Amino acid sequence: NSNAFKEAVKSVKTILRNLTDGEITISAYDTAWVALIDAGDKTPAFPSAVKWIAENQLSDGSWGDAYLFSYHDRLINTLACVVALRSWNLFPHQCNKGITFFRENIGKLEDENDEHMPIGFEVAFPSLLEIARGINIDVPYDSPVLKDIYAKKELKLTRIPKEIMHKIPTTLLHSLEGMRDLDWEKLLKLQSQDGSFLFSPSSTAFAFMQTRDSNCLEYLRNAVKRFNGGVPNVFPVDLFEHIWIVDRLQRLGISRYFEEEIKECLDYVHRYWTDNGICWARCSHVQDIDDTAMAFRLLRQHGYQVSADVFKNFEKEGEFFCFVGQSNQAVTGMFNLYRASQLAFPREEILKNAKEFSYNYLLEKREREELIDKWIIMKDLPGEIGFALEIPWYASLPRVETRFYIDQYGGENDVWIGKTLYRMPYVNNNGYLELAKQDYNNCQAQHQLEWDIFQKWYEENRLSEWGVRRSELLECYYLAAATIFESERSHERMVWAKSSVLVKAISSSFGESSDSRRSFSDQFHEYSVQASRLAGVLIGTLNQMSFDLFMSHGRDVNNLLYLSWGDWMEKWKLYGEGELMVKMIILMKNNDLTNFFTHTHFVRLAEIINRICLPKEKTIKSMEKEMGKMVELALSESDTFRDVSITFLDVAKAFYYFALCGDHLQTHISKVLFQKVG
Ligand SMILES: C/C(=C\CC/C(C)=C/CSP(=O)(O)OP(=O)(O)O)CC/C=C(\C)CCCN(C)C
Numbered sequence: 001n002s003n004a005f006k007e008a009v010k011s012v013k014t015i016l017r018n019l020t021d022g023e024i025t026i027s028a029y030d031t032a033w034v035a036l037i038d039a040g041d042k043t044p045a046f047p048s049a050v051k052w053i054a055e056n057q058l059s060d061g062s063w064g065d066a067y068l069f070s071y072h073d074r075l076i077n078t079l080a081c082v083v084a085l086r087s088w089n090l091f092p093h094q095c096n097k098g099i100t101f102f103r104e105n106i107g108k109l110e111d112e113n114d115e116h117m118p119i120g121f122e123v124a125f126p127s128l129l130e131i132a133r134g135i136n137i138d139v140p141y142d143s144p145v146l147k148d149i150y151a152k153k154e155l156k157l158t159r160i161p162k163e164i165m166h167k168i169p170t171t172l173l174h175s176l177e178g179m180r181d182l183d184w185e186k187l188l189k190l191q192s193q194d195g196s197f198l199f200s201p202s203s204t205a206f207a208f209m210q211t212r213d214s215n216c217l218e219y220l221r222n223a224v225k226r227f228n229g230g231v232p233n234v235f236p237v238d239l240f241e242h243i244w245i246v247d248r249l250q251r252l253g254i255s256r257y258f259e260e261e262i263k264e265c266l267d268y269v270h271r272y273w274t275d276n277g278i279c280w281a282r283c284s285h286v287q288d289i290d291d292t293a294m295a296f297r298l299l300r301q302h303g304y305q306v307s308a309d310v311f312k313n314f315e316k317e318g319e320f321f322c323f324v325g326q327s328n329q330a331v332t333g334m335f336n337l338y339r340a341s342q343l344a345f346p347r348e349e350i351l352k353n354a355k356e357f358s359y360n361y362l363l364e365k366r367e368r369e370e371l372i373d374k375w376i377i378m379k380d381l382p383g384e385i386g387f388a389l390e391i392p393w394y395a396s397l398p399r400v401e402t403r404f405y406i407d408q409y410g411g412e413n414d415v416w417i418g419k420t421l422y423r424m425p426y427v428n429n430n431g432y433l434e435l436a437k438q439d440y441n442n443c444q445a446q447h448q449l450e451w452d453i454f455q456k457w458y459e460e461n462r463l464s465e466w467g468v469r470r471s472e473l474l475e476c477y478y479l480a481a482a483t484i485f486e487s488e489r490s491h492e493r494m495v496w497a498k499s500s501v502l503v504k505a506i507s508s509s510f511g512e513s514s515d516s517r518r519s520f521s522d523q524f525h526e527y528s529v530q531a532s533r534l535a536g537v538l539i540g541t542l543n544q545m546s547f548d549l550f551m552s553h554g555r556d557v558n559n560l561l562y563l564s565w566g567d568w569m570e571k572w573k574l575y576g577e578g579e580l581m582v583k584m585i586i587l588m589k590n591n592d593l594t595n596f597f598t599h600t601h602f603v604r605l606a607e608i609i610n611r612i613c614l615p616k617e618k619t620i621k622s623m624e625k626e627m628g629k630m631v632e633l634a635l636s637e638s639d640t641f642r643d644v645s646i647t648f649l650d651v652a653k654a655f656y657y658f659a660l661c662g663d664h665l666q667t668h669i670s671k672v673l674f675q676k677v678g
Pocket residue numbers: 117118119120121122171172174198234240280290291323328375417418419
């Protein structure tokens with residue numbers, strides 16, 4: 001909580017409060033199509049788009065992404081801008097430098113092995129070349145590398161279902177500028193509600209040139225105004241931006257700083273949610289599975305009511321697809337489907353099918369070394385997918401997922417792929433990463449203090465002689481700290497860790513028979529020599545914890561502590577650790593939620609947790625089924641009771657993670673607790 005830290009938090013809040021239709025970089029290709037429009041008197045309709053072009057040429061004469069050089073991106077943006085400038089006979093200094101760049105680099109188009117192909121390049125690029133030849137621009141139309149691209153365009157055009165494109169909304173509307181022989185009377189019926197052709201400024205500019213439709217013009221006027229002459233390759237991106245910012249702040253481990261602002265963002269997303277899902281932009285007649293899956297997951301996680309029926313439209317013969325009627329299955333979309341499918345409730349068959357499909361799809365891509373995505377160049381997509389394949393959501397503890405994501409997140413260096421390369425500065429942001437590194441390291445420093453205190457407690461109480469090994473001590477501390485990690489929740493974190501250790505000692509030391517258990521239970525109330533000693537350890541520890549909470553927060557929970565341990569002991573002697581830990585955590589909270597221990601919803605959750613937290617595949621699957629019921633109950637909870645339901649889910653996930661991964665935790669424990677980020 002340095003001043004600098006607080007100011008950084010305030011800067012992220014200012015971002016969140018001020019989101020509108022998307023902070024997205026300008027596409028020179030799209031700006032050039034806007035700049036081509038004739039106002040009606042043989043002058044540009046948008047002189048500020050022509051100015052943008054001339055002002056934003058790169059020093060080598062190209063246009064495009066300055067920080068990620070791609071021949072495809074540079075050559076299509078540069079050709080478009082030269083066509084725009086030459087068409088009006090304006091800015092010849094820039095126009096000629098662009099022609100020089102094109103002449104010198106066109107032969108290099110295919111030089112980069114792993115270069116990602118801009119969307120629609122193979123139709124859009126030859127189309128621009130034919131415009132350029134029409135206005136007599138002297139570039140090498142006969143460059144040898146250009147034989148195979150032109151062949152591809154005619155092939156693509158014969159495959160497009162052009163009659164369907166005129167009847168129902170499809171993704172083809174985003175790219176009309178490379179097509180010929182269109183029927184505008186039909187296509188105008190498919191205009192989006194903001195005047196665009198599927199949120200593409202270039203496609204909309206071409207439509208306007210062919211139809212002079214006023215609603216196309218208003219979409220363009222609005223975009224050119226917002227971006228001071230330029231336009232992006234897709235706009236708006238309001239839903240994409242709202243959803244991805246929430247996802248990134250959550251995964252980076254810093255979302256608790258932004259609770260109010262995140263609620264407002266998700267209220268916005270929910271306002272535009274529909275029974276058919278969503279795309280990147282509100283109020284669309286085309287939806288996509290990546291936006292739909294991300295919004296579904298975040299809305300369900302935050303307690304909004306959403307139906308898994310939204311996914312039905314994307315399913316075909318047991319497989320799932322990014323868009324209806326297209327074969328694309330992007331790694332990132334299927335990753336986001338896999339994440340969403342894990343929030344399925346027991347009755348949601350379509351998500352069970354989606355979970356199987358997307359898990360197996362990603363497993364195969366990983367095996368074949370095809371974890372590469374058409375929509376984005378990321379720092380570490382294989383790392384993200386690898387973690388998701390290895391650690392299901394039911395086993396994913398907050399600090400474990402965050403510790404790995406902070407090393408995967410690309411910050412400002414990720415680049416998205418549209419018709420041209422683009423950036424999303426409020427999704428992919430180095431300041432978020434710096435805040436996340438600082439916060440992670442600050443919490444980790446506190447955990448290291450506590451780990452020293454905990455080892456001193458273990459040694460002073462001689463717990464090694466009551467059957468608790470050093471390796472177990474570290475596991476108990478880790479599961480608690482990786483779950484309840486905040487510096488201000490030390491009391492909850494430490495009561496869970498110490499309680500779990502004492503249950504192990506008591507069980508190891510007195511759990512063998514009914515006599516041994518009675519012996520211990522009697523000594524607890526009475527406080528056989530041995531049982532009295534371990535009993536005093538337990539009692540001393542409860543007293544210290546309640547005293548510390550009283551001195552720090554004024555809350556007296558002593559009687560509550562003893563009641564809960566008493567209840568656990570009764571059942572143990574006869575024959576429920578999950579429920580004991582949940583009560584302990586709730587007791588140490590800086591408020592009073594213990595009034596809920598009697599509530600029907602508490603009792604229901606307690607019944608389920610005691611079935612998860614058992615005293616192997618079959619056992620894991622049994623736990624998952626019970627987990628599924630807990631999730632549905634917890635996620636459907638009243639706001640005041642939310643903290644309690646969250647606690648049940650916390651404890652259960654720690655148990656599930658241990659059951660699944662507990663044979664080989666060493667690298668996770670080291671990264672989470674003992675290796676600083678950065
Ligand atoms: C309508 C769009 C693409 C064109 C249609 C498609 C899909 C063609 C791939 S089919 P193909 O395999 O044949 O390859 P090409 O022919 O198109 O080059 C998407 C525009 C939106 C964005 C850029 C925002 C994405 C935000 N999302 C990441 C969250």
